[PDB]
Amino acid sequence: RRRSLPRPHDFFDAQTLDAIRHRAICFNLSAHIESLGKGHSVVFHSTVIAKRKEDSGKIKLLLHWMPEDILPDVWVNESERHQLKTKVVHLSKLPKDTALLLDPNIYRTMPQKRLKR
Amino acid sequence: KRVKSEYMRLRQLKRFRRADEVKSMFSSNRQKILERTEILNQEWKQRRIQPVHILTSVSSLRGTRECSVTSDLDFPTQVIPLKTLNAVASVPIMYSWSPLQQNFMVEDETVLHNIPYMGDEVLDQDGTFIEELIKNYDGKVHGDRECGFINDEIFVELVNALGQYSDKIFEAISSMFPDKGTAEELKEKYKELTEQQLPGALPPECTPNIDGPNAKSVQREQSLHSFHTLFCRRCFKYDCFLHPFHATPNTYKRKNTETALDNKPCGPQCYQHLEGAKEFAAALTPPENVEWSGAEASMFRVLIGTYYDNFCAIARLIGTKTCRQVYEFRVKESSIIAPAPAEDVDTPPRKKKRKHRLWAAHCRKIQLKKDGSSNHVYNYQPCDHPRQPCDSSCPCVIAQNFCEKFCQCSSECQNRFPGCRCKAQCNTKQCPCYLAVRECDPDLCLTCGAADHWDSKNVSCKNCSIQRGSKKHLLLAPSDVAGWGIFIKDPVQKNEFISEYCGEIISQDEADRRGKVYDKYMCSFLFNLNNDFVVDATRKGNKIRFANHSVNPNCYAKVMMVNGDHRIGIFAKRAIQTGEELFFDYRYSQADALKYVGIEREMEIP
Amino acid sequence: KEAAFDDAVEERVINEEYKIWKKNTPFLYDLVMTHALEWPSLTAQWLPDVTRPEGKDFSIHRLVLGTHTSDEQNHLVIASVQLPNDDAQFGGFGSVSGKIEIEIKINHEGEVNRARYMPQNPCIIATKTPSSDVLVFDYTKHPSKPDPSGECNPDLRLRGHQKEGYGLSWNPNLSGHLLSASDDHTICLWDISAVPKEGKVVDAKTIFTGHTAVVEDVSWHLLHESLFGSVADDQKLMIWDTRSNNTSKPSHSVDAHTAEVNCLSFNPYSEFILATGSADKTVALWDLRNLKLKLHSFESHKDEIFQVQWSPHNETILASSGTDRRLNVWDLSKIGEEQSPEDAEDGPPELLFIHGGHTAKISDFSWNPNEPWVICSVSEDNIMQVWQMAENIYN
Amino acid sequence: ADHELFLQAFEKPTQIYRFLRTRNLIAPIFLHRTLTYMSHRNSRTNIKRKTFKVDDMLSKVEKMKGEQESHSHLQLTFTGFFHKVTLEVLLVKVCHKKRKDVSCPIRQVPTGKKQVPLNPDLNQTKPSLAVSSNEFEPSNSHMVKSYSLLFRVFVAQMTVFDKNRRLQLLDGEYEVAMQEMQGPTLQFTLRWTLRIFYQFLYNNNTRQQTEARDDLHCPWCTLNCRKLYSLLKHLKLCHSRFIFNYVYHPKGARIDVSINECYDGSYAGNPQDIHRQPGFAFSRNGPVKRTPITHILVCRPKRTKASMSEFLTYSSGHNRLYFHSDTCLPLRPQEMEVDSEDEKDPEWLREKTITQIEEFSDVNEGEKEVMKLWNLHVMKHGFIADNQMNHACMLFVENYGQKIIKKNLCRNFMLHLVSMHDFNLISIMSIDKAVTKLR
Amino acid sequence: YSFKCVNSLKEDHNQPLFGVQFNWHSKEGDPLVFATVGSNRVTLYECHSQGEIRLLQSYVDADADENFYTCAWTYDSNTSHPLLAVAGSRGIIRIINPITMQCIKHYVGHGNAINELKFHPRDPNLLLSVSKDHALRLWNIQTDTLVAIFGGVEGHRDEVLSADYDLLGEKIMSCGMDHSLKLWRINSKRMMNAIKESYDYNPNKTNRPFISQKIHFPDFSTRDIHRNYVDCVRWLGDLILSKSCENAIVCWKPGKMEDDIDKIKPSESNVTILGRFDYSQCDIWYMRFSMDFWQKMLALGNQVGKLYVWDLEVEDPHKAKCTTLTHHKCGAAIRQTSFSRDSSILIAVCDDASIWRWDRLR
Amino acid sequence: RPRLQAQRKFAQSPPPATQISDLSKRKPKTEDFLTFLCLRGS
Numbered sequence A: 001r002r003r004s005l006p007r008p009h010d011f012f013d014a015q016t017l018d019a020i021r022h023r024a025i026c027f028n029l030s031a032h033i034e035s036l037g038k039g040h041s042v043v044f045h046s047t048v049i050a051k052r053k054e055d056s057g058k059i060k061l062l063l064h065w066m067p068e069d070i071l072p073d074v075w076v077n078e079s080e081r082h083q084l085k086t087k088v089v090h091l092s093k094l095p096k097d098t099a100l101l102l103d104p105n106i107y108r109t110m111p112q113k114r115l116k117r
Numbered sequence B: 001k002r003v004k005s006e007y008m009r010l011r012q013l014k015r016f017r018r019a020d021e022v023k024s025m026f027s028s029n030r031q032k033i034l035e036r037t038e039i040l041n042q043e044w045k046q047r048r049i050q051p052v053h054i055l056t057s058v059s060s061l062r063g064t065r066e067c068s069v070t071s072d073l074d075f076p077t078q079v080i081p082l083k084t085l086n087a088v089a090s091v092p093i094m095y096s097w098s099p100l101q102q103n104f105m106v107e108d109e110t111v112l113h114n115i116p117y118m119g120d121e122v123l124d125q126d127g128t129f130i131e132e133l134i135k136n137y138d139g140k141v142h143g144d145r146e147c148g149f150i151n152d153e154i155f156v157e158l159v160n161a162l163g164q165y166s167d168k169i170f171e172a173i174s175s176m177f178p179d180k181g182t183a184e185e186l187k188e189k190y191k192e193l194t195e196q197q198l199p200g201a202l203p204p205e206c207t208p209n210i211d212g213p214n215a216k217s218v219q220r221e222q223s224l225h226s227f228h229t230l231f232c233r234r235c236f237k238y239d240c241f242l243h244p245f246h247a248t249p250n251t252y253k254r255k256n257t258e259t260a261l262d263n264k265p266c267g268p269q270c271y272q273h274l275e276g277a278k279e280f281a282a283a284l285t286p287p288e289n290v291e292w293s294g295a296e297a298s299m300f301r302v303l304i305g306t307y308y309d310n311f312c313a314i315a316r317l318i319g320t321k322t323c324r325q326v327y328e329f330r331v332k333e334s335s336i337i338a339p340a341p342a343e344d345v346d347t348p349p350r351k352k353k354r355k356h357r358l359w360a361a362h363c364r365k366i367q368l369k370k371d372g373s374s375n376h377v378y379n380y381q382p383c384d385h386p387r388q389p390c391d392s393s394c395p396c397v398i399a400q401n402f403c404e405k406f407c408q409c410s411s412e413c414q415n416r417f418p419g420c421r422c423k424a425q426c427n428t429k430q431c432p433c434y435l436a437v438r439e440c441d442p443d444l445c446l447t448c449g450a451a452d453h454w455d456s457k458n459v460s461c462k463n464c465s466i467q468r469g470s471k472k473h474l475l476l477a478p479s480d481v482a483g484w485g486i487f488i489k490d491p492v493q494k495n496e497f498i499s500e501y502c503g504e505i506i507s508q509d510e511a512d513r514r515g516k517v518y519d520k521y522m523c524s525f526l527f528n529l530n531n532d533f534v535v536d537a538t539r540k541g542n543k544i545r546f547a548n549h550s551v552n553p554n555c556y557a558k559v560m561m562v563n564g565d566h567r568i569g570i571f572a573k574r575a576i577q578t579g580e581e582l583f584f585d586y587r588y589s590q591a592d593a594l595k596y597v598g599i600e601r602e603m604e605i606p
Numbered sequence C: 001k002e003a004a005f006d007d008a009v010e011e012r013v014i015n016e017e018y019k020i021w022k023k024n025t026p027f028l029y030d031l032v033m034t035h036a037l038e039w040p041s042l043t044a045q046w047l048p049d050v051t052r053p054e055g056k057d058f059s060i061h062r063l064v065l066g067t068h069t070s071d072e073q074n075h076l077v078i079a080s081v082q083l084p085n086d087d088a089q090f091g092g093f094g095s096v097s098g099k100i101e102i103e104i105k106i107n108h109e110g111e112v113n114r115a116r117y118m119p120q121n122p123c124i125i126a127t128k129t130p131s132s133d134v135l136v137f138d139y140t141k142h143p144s145k146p147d148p149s150g151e152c153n154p155d156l157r158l159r160g161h162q163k164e165g166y167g168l169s170w171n172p173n174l175s176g177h178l179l180s181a182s183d184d185h186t187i188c189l190w191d192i193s194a195v196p197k198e199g200k201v202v203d204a205k206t207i208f209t210g211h212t213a214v215v216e217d218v219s220w221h222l223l224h225e226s227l228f229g230s231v232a233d234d235q236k237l238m239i240w241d242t243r244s245n246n247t248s249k250p251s252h253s254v255d256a257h258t259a260e261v262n263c264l265s266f267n268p269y270s271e272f273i274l275a276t277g278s279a280d281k282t283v284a285l286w287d288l289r290n291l292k293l294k295l296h297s298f299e300s301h302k303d304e305i306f307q308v309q310w311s312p313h314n315e316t317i318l319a320s321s322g323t324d325r326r327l328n329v330w331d332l333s334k335i336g337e338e339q340s341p342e343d344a345e346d347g348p349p350e351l352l353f354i355h356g357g358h359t360a361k362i363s364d365f366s367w368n369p370n371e372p373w374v375i376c377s378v379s380e381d382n383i384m385q386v387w388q389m390a391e392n393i394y395n
Numbered sequence D: 001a002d003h004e005l006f007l008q009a010f011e012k013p014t015q016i017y018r019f020l021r022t023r024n025l026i027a028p029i030f031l032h033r034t035l036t037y038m039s040h041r042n043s044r045t046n047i048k049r050k051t052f053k054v055d056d057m058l059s060k061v062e063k064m065k066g067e068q069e070s071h072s073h074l075q076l077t078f079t080g081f082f083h084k085v086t087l088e089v090l091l092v093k094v095c096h097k098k099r100k101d102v103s104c105p106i107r108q109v110p111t112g113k114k115q116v117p118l119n120p121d122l123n124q125t126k127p128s129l130a131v132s133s134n135e136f137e138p139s140n141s142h143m144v145k146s147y148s149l150l151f152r153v154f155v156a157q158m159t160v161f162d163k164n165r166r167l168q169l170l171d172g173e174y175e176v177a178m179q180e181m182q183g184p185t186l187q188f189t190l191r192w193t194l195r196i197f198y199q200f201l202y203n204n205n206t207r208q209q210t211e212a213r214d215d216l217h218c219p220w221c222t223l224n225c226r227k228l229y230s231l232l233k234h235l236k237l238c239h240s241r242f243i244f245n246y247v248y249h250p251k252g253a254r255i256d257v258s259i260n261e262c263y264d265g266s267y268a269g270n271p272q273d274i275h276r277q278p279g280f281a282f283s284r285n286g287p288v289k290r291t292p293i294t295h296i297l298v299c300r301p302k303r304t305k306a307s308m309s310e311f312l313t314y315s316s317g318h319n320r321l322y323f324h325s326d327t328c329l330p331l332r333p334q335e336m337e338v339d340s341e342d343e344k345d346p347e348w349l350r351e352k353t354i355t356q357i358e359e360f361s362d363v364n365e366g367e368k369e370v371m372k373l374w375n376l377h378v379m380k381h382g383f384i385a386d387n388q389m390n391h392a393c394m395l396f397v398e399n400y401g402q403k404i405i406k407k408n409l410c411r412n413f414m415l416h417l418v419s420m421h422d423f424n425l426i427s428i429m430s431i432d433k434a435v436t437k438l439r
Numbered sequence E: 001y002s003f004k005c006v007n008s009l010k011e012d013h014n015q016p017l018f019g020v021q022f023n024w025h026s027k028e029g030d031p032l033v034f035a036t037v038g039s040n041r042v043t044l045y046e047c048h049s050q051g052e053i054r055l056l057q058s059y060v061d062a063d064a065d066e067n068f069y070t071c072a073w074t075y076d077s078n079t080s081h082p083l084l085a086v087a088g089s090r091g092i093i094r095i096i097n098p099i100t101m102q103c104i105k106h107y108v109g110h111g112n113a114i115n116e117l118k119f120h121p122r123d124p125n126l127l128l129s130v131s132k133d134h135a136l137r138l139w140n141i142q143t144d145t146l147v148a149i150f151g152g153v154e155g156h157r158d159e160v161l162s163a164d165y166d167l168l169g170e171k172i173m174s175c176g177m178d179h180s181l182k183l184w185r186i187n188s189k190r191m192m193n194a195i196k197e198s199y200d201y202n203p204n205k206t207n208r209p210f211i212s213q214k215i216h217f218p219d220f221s222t223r224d225i226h227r228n229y230v231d232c233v234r235w236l237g238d239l240i241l242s243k244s245c246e247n248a249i250v251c252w253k254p255g256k257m258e259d260d261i262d263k264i265k266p267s268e269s270n271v272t273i274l275g276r277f278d279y280s281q282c283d284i285w286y287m288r289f290s291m292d293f294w295q296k297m298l299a300l301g302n303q304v305g306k307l308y309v310w311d312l313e314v315e316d317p318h319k320a321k322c323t324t325l326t327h328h329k330c331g332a333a334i335r336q337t338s339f340s341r342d343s344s345i346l347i348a349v350c351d352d353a354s355i356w357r358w359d360r361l362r
Numbered sequence F: 001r002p003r004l005q006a007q008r009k010f011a012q013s014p015p016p017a018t019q020i021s022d023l024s025k026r027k028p029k030t031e032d033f034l035t036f037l038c039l040r041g042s
């Protein structure tokens, strides 16, 4: 090499920088990955769902989380009230079949519509 | 000077005369303006175009940049987020050029005819560079500061202010208008005006064409005078673009014994086969019924110099001539003209058993000792004057070059070589032509096979490729070091040929004049060719020029002479595989090389 | 349509990831060698015979591919590969000119999608079916230089199919037996062991149809000459036994993944085990005797999977590829093994290292039966890669 | 002065890898536990043989011990609504996403609509029923996903099966809050029948001072590197967009980052598609042709030990894209074979000889015509040698014999042969051959 | 005819602009939409009346420090859409479709910077491009192919910075740094044959690349017309409207007065000047000019912003017109003028990234 | 001399050190800080 070697044309054009820039804004104002998500995780916010009455006086609770990326709603015990209001799931333990819905730049089929198989 | 005022008054009189011409032309062209703009307007009215939508913003504008446009007066400062259109891989800087595989001499006129653009910032700090640039030619510019240009009548009337005193009047007019600039050309201009004609776009002796309707009889030399003055012997092409016309005509001997004119009956139409006519022909070794026209006489005067012996061929060539009348016309011409000498020499003694080796040994001492201390390699210039037969005044001798076939020296001059004795690919140290750093010329080197298989472009004889022109396949691609580069799509072995660094053959002075702007423009193309010529490839050339230079180049460029002309040859220093940029050392001066070509490809890896 | 914008953005993303993977290769692989082809290949199956030249530190391998030309005549191609067959085999490692050669090129009518050679005679390779007819090519007789005078006149062609297919597998135990799948919902049986007569056309020996959707693969058992498994797109694979004289009654009524399943392969070193991969982003293995019971399913992929390969050099090493732009090797020995959260968050314990040397869908891949660990992977991007793990994960 | 240029220069490397963090955590291009210098992870040593006759028995035992979920028919009874009316419900069966399905298809099965109380008050109860058919079969319901229930009054949804196909419900009274359009709700029941520091380096005259926390975790890809050497090595390998230099801090270590000076290899796909206009670029709908290239980066690494002191590419192919010399136009790989774009007779020089010959004064077109044509021919074939020109004259006559015969320029053409013989180029015999072929 | 205006603009980026062109292809009654170029952003503008100028979304090539010098309007024959072609210092021509607000085609092949472009008035898919490397590039947008070049040394020998078509689009006149003014005839058989072949070429149709040619030799050349660098040309019937920094626009034609504009061979070098205009303070080059569509009126910007406006008729050039319009705040330089389809709107460029609109009192 | 001069073309005429939250100060440079340390990271 030498002192003034030219820089090859960066394939990452500026409009892709703008797209990732806007994605950064939306994810900083939606999930707060840096602060709430601890950088490596996504926070899920539960809401008020239906409550079912079992044989005992205690009522089995149901919680569905706001992002609803891939997790299905599952019944929880009565103790989950005010304790499972906010949960943080690492990106790794999110399901590996249907979690792409949080953002479609995270993963997509590059050929998309395939002329061949 | 009052000459300019008188010229202006005369031009004003001419403009008063042409005030109707300009008015009529303006009216006529305005009619065409209307008639050609109405059709365009009607075509636009024919079809419909989709209007552009109002300003809109995408959801990604939050992360995208936003711009505003303000107004000087009371208008809202409208804003709109930018749209980042996708970028492209821009090519490096390049300058257009006409492709060619040979050279092209360029006239050395000391006229700039432009002033190159410069940064406009360093000039404020130091604008002396343009002054140094123009001072090299002369402290002027194209058009100078005269600010005067008028018609021929006005220029003539400029001298009319002092014409009653002419030389002084013409000098004043020349000082007024830089178009002519000399009172001496006024004499030739006035001679042409008094003749009310010119030399003409034809032979001046009233003949438009010798083969045209003006079938006037002319002498042999005059007919070929325009032919030979425009025929260059070096490149063999009429009106050469790389050789001057300052040369003697084809006043050379020939094998006159070839035209034997063997005794054979040529039929009734024959200058021979008639007792009186044959007797006259034998002595020269009834009158014609048809009088040959001027074209026939003119062509006879030319074909006699080529085919003195046989009348049949001359009659066969001339349409307006008959071989039966050939004897009578020859008698009449020889009565009215003179014969030709047709010089030839015998030179009985000859020996090639060892004389070739003795001459080769003699050439080595000159080329090593007497030519290595000259510090200059003058451009090849054949000598055609008997004023110094193999002496110290023949240009081929003072330049230490060889009096080859193209030089008018003796047919057996010792200052020439018999070509390649070796058949061993003409590139080893046993090759005399490789030893003399010159491509073997095919008509002499019958051993290496340069003349053998002319149609073949894969000659087994190396060191003759430029003569064959069989350049390898080269591909242009951007260079990782700087600017463009040249990349080869095929592997190249030891000392294999790559295309010649073609360009413009120009004198040392003109090349140095161009170097002053090349240094500022940083895209130089000049390294010396010979003590008289330097090849410039900025305007013409090929893909070779894109090859850069590094401290460890992969090729080597040796400036080398081909067929009496110096050509910059490119050969690979080492074996280079496919897809590698070609680098050859420029032999560049160390300080100015580090100033210009100091960029290195590979650092100190070990 | 916003698909194009996202596609371009993710194209730049995949370029960035390919660069990042490329610079991580020396501390990830013991051997990375990527190659580009004039036209893409949908078949990547290492030839079994590998020649080892003496003295030099590299061996001469041969690899079967196929030109997928979208403009001109497609050609069946066999490409040779040099690999560092030496302990100290450190320009590169061997000859610096011919690490990739295209010495064998044979004309083919249409592109090659799934080519599989003969274990019994690798000179005979079937180019599957970009037609209604399955062609047979013997690369020994065909010239090295592809003559453009039409097709290469295949030695034999097989009737029985109607539409295209992507499944192919030769009988490892019986000579001259082939089964192939197609979109016609059908698998055709062929007997190429004896073709004495003229015409050079061999009809289907027996048509097999027991699936309600497209069949995409079929394979014979290596320790069972008559028992062969089949898989289809009706979320169902089915095991077929010959000599039953029934084209619709399966030997064992079984069901595949909840979604479309496209590949089926057996392990050579066992009598019962069978593995398959589906479009449900999962690869699951079955058994010949435990049909109904589910042993395990692999959930590392994210898109459809249509290729599975048991490592010939081991019994418990598996590999699979799909449109996920990833290549996964499976080590069944570590199935369900407990591991620290750092190991778990990277991937499941049974999953070996995930190969990521591609920019498109991995069309096909295979392991050469000569070197203990060797595997190539092709793609529609003409990206030809031969990669090896660093020894640290398997000692 | 502003430092926004520095932030803009470092932001492009930043956000790229920050998004790649999510992309790789969801979809790892490689397992981080399998890296040679990350090998402190993946503690599961490969020591087992795992004969194929142990997993079948274990799976059979697990299946025998499993099957905890049980079922018979699903039933339910409606109590009413509440607001601060006839009701309609539906049964939906969902199939997993197939190749021809963009997403998982949902198919609904109608049932019998009934009436519900219009938000009854307390103690207002004083009968509506819906029953499900036992159509759940392993063969019929193999391809279906977990079933779900539709409720409309005001639409609600709730499933029945769990992740492992187990029942998620039970026979009991359900108080369901309705997602209309406290608050809307519905009532009913169901029945069954060390420390490190960071530094940023660009225009080092001034910079924004930085600090570091969560040392073993990378700031960009949030990877926990339990070895300090491996952290810097991973930064070097996965973050070429930065240049890291280590200095021993008085209270630990310190890393100074700097934007890459060159950062080569920006694009690695087909070079032909770099310059192409949008729409036709990066299509991949069908096969595309690219020049064959061979690139090798790993052959046999020395596999040195993890040494801290270490901190203070072969390729044979066309690679880069080639452009036309004359027009600076990118060259198609298929056109590459014959697009030499260089031949002995350029057209511009063909017109140049015509213009310069015709331009001269003391000669007329009667001779300038042949003067122009001979140059055209000789420069078309590029003759060099004298014996080459002896047949160059013959080839001139061969090319233009019919044209001259229809043109009748023999006498003017005779001047060319005279000049040829005056220079001894054309022999006497070759003079006649230019005449017989002329007619 | 006299122009009056109380209005001005100014772009925030503050680097000089280098050309404005109106969308003359807009139908009757469409809003007056014109393009502006310069400072790595393509800023389109919309004008209706009352001095209001409405911006369109600017397209920025922020990948490098590009300088833009070229705008040129055209329409798509296939879909009837307004297209704009922009080229800059990087030697890259960009085609952006404002209807979709996104670029569609780019063109590469320029060895150096690119000056102002003009579109073929008869065939909308043909675009001629000047270049800093003494070359002239003509393009076929409908097939994205390159057609014959005018870049040989026989053409311009230095920086070409102006070109124009005639009204009928038959001949091309251009000027460069070397004071040359040369004519290339589109109506020459070779040229429309090349154009027809360009419209007939598809890259997938044949493996052979589109065989373009090189046009080194124009049909006329002259240098003595202007002693300084001529930087702008326009067509007035068969005459030439050229400007150089001798502070004078001149009118002239090849050949003599009676010489036909079509039969004149390149050998003839006679030049007759039949018109000249005068102004003040034409010191800095690139100070281009343009006419209205009807060519009835001419204006030229000045470095102090003076707009010397002259109505064109069959009258004598000596006293053609002496009308000058100037605003007290337009002291910045001006390098390009543009007119609407009618003479109603005249809008020029400046050096301080300011945009000025002049309104006709008709 | 008037025509010999060069064509000049124109007229002659938060500071304190920040943790990895500073990284969060550069992807979302606008649209709220998303964390209080970004203000200290300015």
Ligand SMILES: Nc1ncnc2c1ncn2[C@@H]1O[C@H](CSCC[C@H](N)C(=O)O)[C@@H](O)[C@H]1O
Pocket: B479, B481, B482, B483, B484, B485, B522, B523, B524, B525, B545, B546, B547, B548, B549, B550, B596, B597, B598, B599, B600
């Ligand atoms: N290795 C190198 N690094 C930087 N500049 C170089 C170079 N080799 C040549 N040059 C420059 O290029 C000119 C020689 S011609 C070299 C190729 C051509 N100019 C191009 O850029 O594509 C010289 O003026 C020199 O300044």
